[PDB]
């Protein structure tokens, strides 16, 4: 849940990591 799974942005958020995830995750 905690840090980052595919790229070195490693914080203590979970849930700024979910929507840094949901970045992880829509480009336009
Ligand atoms: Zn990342």
Redesign the pocket.
Known sequence: KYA?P??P?RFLRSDHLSK??K??XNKK
């Open positions: 980052c595919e790229c942005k840094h995830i970045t992880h």
